[PDB]
Amino acid sequence: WLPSRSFIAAVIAIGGMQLLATMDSTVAIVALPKIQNELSLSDAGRSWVITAYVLTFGGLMLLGGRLGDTIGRKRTFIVGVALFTISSVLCAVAWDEATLVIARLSQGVGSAIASPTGLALVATTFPKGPARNAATAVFAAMTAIGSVMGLVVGGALTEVSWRWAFLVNVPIGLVMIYLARTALRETNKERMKLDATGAILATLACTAAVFAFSIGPEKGWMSGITIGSGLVALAAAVAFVIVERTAENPVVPFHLFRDRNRLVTFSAILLAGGVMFSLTVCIGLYVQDILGYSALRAGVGFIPFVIAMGIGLGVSSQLVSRFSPRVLTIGGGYLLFGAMLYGSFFMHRGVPYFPNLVMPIVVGGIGIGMAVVPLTLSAIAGVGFDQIGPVSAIALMLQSLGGPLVLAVIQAVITSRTLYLGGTTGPVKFMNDVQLAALDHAYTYGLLWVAGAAIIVGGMALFIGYTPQQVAHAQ
Amino acid sequence: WLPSRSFIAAVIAIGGMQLLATMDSTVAIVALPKIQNELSLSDAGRSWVITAYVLTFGGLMLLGGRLGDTIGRKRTFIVGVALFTISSVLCAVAWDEATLVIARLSQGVGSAIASPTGLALVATTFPKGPARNAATAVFAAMTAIGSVMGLVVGGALTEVSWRWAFLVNVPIGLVMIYLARTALRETNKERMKLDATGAILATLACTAAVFAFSIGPEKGWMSGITIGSGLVALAAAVAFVIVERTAENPVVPFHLFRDRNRLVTFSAILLAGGVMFSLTVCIGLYVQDILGYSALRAGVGFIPFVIAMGIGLGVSSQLVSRFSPRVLTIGGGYLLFGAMLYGSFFMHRGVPYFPNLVMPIVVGGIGIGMAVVPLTLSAIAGVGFDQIGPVSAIALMLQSLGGPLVLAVIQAVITSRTLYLGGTTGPVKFMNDVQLAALDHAYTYGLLWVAGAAIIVGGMALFIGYTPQQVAHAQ
C-alpha cells in the first residue's frame, strides 16, 4: 500500500519511454491526414511520416541493449529520452517534408536508444521478486496508457493545426527525464568495451529489413528497390551472426537461446505482440470507420481498456509468485479469446457502446493484462547483469516485430472478405450503406483470424517450462 | 410451464432407449470384474462381455432407420425396447460364457433396432419449433441421466452378486415400452418397401468393422483375424455404396450429404461425440483410480454433471430460435474448454471434491448441454418424413463411432506419458505412490489432448451455415 516514492518514480521513469513511443505513434497516425492537407504531401510523404520513425526505431533498437552496458543504463536512458524530446520539439516546427522526415528519423533513433534500456532497467534496478513484478506491471500499464492517451490527444487536437500534437511529447519527455535522473541510481562504474562490428552489422540489417518491409506496399513487392533492401538486410544479418559466433562481447548472445524455456518464451512473445498489435489496429480502424466515432470518441471509449488492462496486470503480478508462467498466460488468453469471440459474433454497424463494445474490450484488456506479466517476467530471467541488456533488447524487438507481420495478414484477409462480399476499395466516405456492412463482416472475420492466432499463441505458450520459483521468488 | 402430459410421456418414451443403452453399458463396465470373478472368465470372456453388445449395436444400427420406415416407427421402437428388456432378463440369469455372450448380442440387436428409431421419432412426432427443441433437450438429458444412473446402480449393487445389476433394465424397459405404446400415435399407414441388399450389406460392413476394431487390442493388430475382418468390412462397405448409388429406396441417402451444412454438421457430430466419450471414460477412470473413489462415489459425484448438463440443454433449447447453431456450439465449447483447462491444470491426487472436482464438472456439463442441442437440431433438419430415418440413424451411428476412435488416441497418449514419467503398467493396486503421481500427470496430459480435440471440433463447427429460421421456427 503506497510504496516508497523512490520506487514509484523509478518505475514511472522506466515506463516513460514506452509511454512516449506509443503516444507519438498514435498521435502521428491520427494527425497524418492533417499533415498531408497542410504540408501538401503526396502519398510518398504520407508513408514517409511513419516510415522515417519506424526505420530508426527498429534499426538501432538492438544497439541500445549493449549501449546501456558500454556507457551506462541510466546515462543511455537519459540520452535517449532527451533525444526523443528534442526530436519532437523540432518535429513540431517542421516547414517541409525533409524536416519532418529528419525529425521522425531522429525520434526513432532516440526511441531505439531508450526503450530497450528501459526494459533492461526493469530487471537491473530491481532484484527478483515483488519489485520486478510491480515494475513489469507498471511497464505494460504505461504502454497502454501511452497508446490511449496518444489517441485521445490526437482526437482533441484534430481541430487545431497538427503542429500542437507533437509538442505534447515535450512536457512528458522532460518529466520522465527528471524522474530517471533523480529516482535512478548509477550502478558500479564497471564499464566494458563494445564490439563495433556486431553493432554496425545488426543496425544495418534491421534498418534494411524495415526499409524493405515499409517500401514494399507503396513501391511494389516485385520492384528492384525492395528486393535490393531485403537482400542487403539478409546479407548483413548473416554476416552479423557469423561475427557473433566468434565475438568476444556478444551483442546478441546466441548461446542463451539453447534453452527451451527461453526460446519458447521469446517465440510466444513475438506472436503475442503480433496478436496485440493486430487487435489494436483492427479495433481502432473498426471504431473509426464502421461505428463513425471520431478519434477523441475512440480514445474515450478505449480508456476502459486501459482500466481493465491495469486491473489484469496487477492481478497477474500478484499471482506470478504462486502460479506458473504457463498457467497465467493461458488464463489471460482464455479471457481474451472469449472477449474476441463475442466481438466477432455480436458486433455490427449501429451496435450500442455500453453493452456491445465496452464489455468485449474490458474482458480482453483483463486477459491481456493477465497474460503480459508472466511473459515479460520470463523474458528477463536467469541472466547476469552484464548480459540482461541484450535479452531485453531482443525481447522488445521481437514484440515490436511481430505486430506488423500479423497485421498484414489480418488486413489482407479483411480486404479480401470486403471485396468478396461486394465492397469497394478506398476511403470509407465514398462507399454507401450497401458497401458498409460488407466492411463490418470483413472486420468480424478478421477478428476470427486473430482468435485463431491467439489459439496458436496459447498452444505455443503451453511449453513454457518456467516455474514461479525462478521468476518471482528472489533468493 | 408443465406442458401436456402426453408430450412429456412422448419425450420420455423417446429418450428411454438412450437411457437404457448407456445405463446398461455403464453397469456392465462396472460389474465386469465381478462377472469375471464369479463365472471364472478369462480375458477373452472379459472382452466378449462388452464386444458382444457393441457388435450388434453398431452392426444393425443403420438398419433401424429404414426399419422404422418399412414397418412403423412406433412399432419398431416397441419391438426394439421389448427385445432389449427380454435380453436383459435373460442376461441376468446366465450360467456360462455362451449364454452371457448371446444375451449381450441380443441386447445389442435390440438397442440398434430401437435407438435410431427414437432419434427419428424426435423429428417425426414433433413439428419444427419449440416441441422439437424440448424433445432434443429431453433426449440428451436422459442420455446423461442413463449414464450416471448406471454408474450409481453398479456402485450400489457391487456388494451383492452381479446378476442383480442387469435386472434393473427390466422395470425401466417396461415403463418406457408402456410410455411409447400409450403416448405415441401411429402415423398414416404409408408402408413402403425395403431394399434387402443395402440393409444386409450395411449390417455386414458395420459388424465386421466393429469386430475388427474390438479384436485388434486383444488378438493383435497384425494378426490374420483382425485384418480379415477389416478387409471384409471394407469390401462390404464398398459394395453397399455401389448398390446405394443405383438403389430405388436408399438406406443411406448419399445425395443429401452434398450440402455443406449437413456434411459439416455430421463431421462435427462425429468428433464431438468422440470428445464427449473420451471425456466421460477418462474422468471416470481418473476418479476411480487416482482419487480412490468407489463406483457409487463416482456416480454421486457425477450427478452434478447431470444437473449442469440439464441446465445447459434447457438454456440451449431456449436460445436455439434466436442464436445460430454455430454461435451456440462455439459458446458451449468455450465453457467446456475452460472447465477442461482448469481440470488439466489444477487436478492432482488428494484434491478436494467441492472446489476442485465439482466446479470443472459443472462448467463442462453446462457447456456440453449448450453445445448438444444445436448440433442434433441441425442434424434433423430439411428432410422429408419418409427420409428422416436414415439421417437420424447416420447421425447416431457417427456419434457412437467417434467415441472409441478418439478414446483410443487419448488412452495411448496417457499410457505413453505414464511410461515416460516412470509408471508401471497394470492394475493400480500394484503400483505404489511414486507410480501414482505419474498416472495423474498422464491423465492431465490426456485432458490437454482432449482440449485440443475440442478446439478442432469448434473450428469445424464454425462452418455450420444453418440459421435459426430453418431449425426452430416452424412454418
Swiss-Prot record, chains A, B:
- The residues on the Cytoplasmic side of the membrane are 69-75, 128-136, 181-195, 244-262, 321-326, 378-393
**Transmembrane portions of the chain:** 7-27, 48-68, 76-96, 107-127, 137-157, 160-180, 196-216, 223-243, 263-283, 300-320, 327-347, 357-377, 394-414, 445-465
| Induction or repression | Expressed during infection of macrophages. Down-regulated by the nucleoid-associated protein Lsr2.
Q: Which residues lie on this side of the membrane: Extracellular?
A: 28-47, 97-106, 158-159, 217-222, 284-299, 348-356, 415-444
Query: Among the entry's GO cellular component annotations, what is one?
Result: plasma membrane
Record's InterPro entries? MFS (IPR011701), MFS_dom (IPR020846), MFS_trans_sf (IPR036259)
What's a Gene Ontology MF term here? Answer: transmembrane transporter activity
* Broad class of the protein's primary localization: membrane
Q: How does it sit in the membrane?
A: Multi-pass membrane protein
Protein family according to the UniProt entry: Belongs to the major facilitator superfamily.
Know the name of this protein?
Uncharacterized MFS-type transporter EfpA
Q: What organism is listed for this UniProt entry?
A: Mycobacterium tuberculosis (strain ATCC 25618 / H37Rv)
UniProt lists the gene as: efpA
